[PDB]
Amino acid sequence: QEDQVDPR
Amino acid sequence: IVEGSDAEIGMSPWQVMLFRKSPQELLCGASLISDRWVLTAAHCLLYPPWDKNFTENDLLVRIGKHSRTRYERNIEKISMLEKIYIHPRYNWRENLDRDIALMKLKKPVAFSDYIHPVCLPDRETAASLLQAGYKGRVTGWGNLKETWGQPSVLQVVNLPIVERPVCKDSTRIRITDNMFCAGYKPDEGKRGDACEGDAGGPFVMKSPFNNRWYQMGIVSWGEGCDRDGKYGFYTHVFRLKKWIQKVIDQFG
C-alpha cells in the first residue's frame, strides 16, 4: 500500500 | 516511540490520547493547549487511503493518562469533542503538508497535577529553540519498533533538530517549510524516533528563559521507524500558528 510516506 | 524509556508520572501532562473503544484502539497522540482546545495531526482524523474520516462522535479524548491499557480512575479526564477543524491545505495525497488539526472540547477542563496545557511558541522562543543540534522531547504510546509491539506506559525520547539540507537529502518525498525533521545522524551513533501510533503527539522544548515547556512540532510521518540516514518529520507548529490563532479566534 506504501506510497513512500509512512503516516504515524 | 523507538529507543525511548518510560515517562515519569506527570512528566508530560499536556499529553492526550486519541482512543476508540470499539474496536479497542489507540488511534493517535495529541496535546492539550488550553482548557478547551486540543492539537493533533490532520491524518489522525482524516486519511482517505486508510478509510479514516472521524467526526466528533467517533472519538474520545483521554487526558492525564499514564497507562495505555488501563482506565486510571483517579487521574484521567475523558472529554468529548464539539468540533473538529482540519487545516484547509492539508495534503493527504502527496506528502502530508500542513498535517494539523484542532479539536474543540465540549466542556472546559480543569487543570491538575496530571492535566496541564503546553505553551505555543512566540517568535523569539520558536526562533531561538528551533536550531539544528538543539534537542526536543517526543512522547506517546505508539510502536516500540518498526512493525507491519506496544508499551504499557507512556514513552519519552529526546531528539536533536536536523539541518534542513540534511532533512532534504534524507528523503525522496517533496518536503515543505511547514515540516521539520529530528533525530540522530548515522555518524552520531545514537538512536531514537517516533513511530506508528505516536502521530499527533507533541515535540516539546523547555525554554531556559521562563522554565516553561513549549510545543514546536507535531509527530507527522517517516519512512519506517529509527532507520539509519532517515529522520522523523514533524508539523512545524510556529509556521502554522496564524492558522491556529485564526481558528480559536473565529470559533472559540
Partner: protein
C-alpha cells in the same frame, strides 16, 4: 488556559527536575 501553560505541578512547581530534561538544556548551551 494560556497564562499557566507549560508548567508541571509535579516538577517545576516543586523545583524538581525530571530524569532527562538536563540533556535538553545541555544541547542548547554546549552540544559538544
Amino acid at each position: 488556559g494560556e497564562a499557566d501553560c507549560g508548567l508541571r505541578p509535579l516538577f517545576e512547581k516543586k523545583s524538581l527536575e525530571d530524569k532527562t530534561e538536563r540533556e535538553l538544556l545541555e544541547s542548547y548551551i554546549d552540544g559538544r
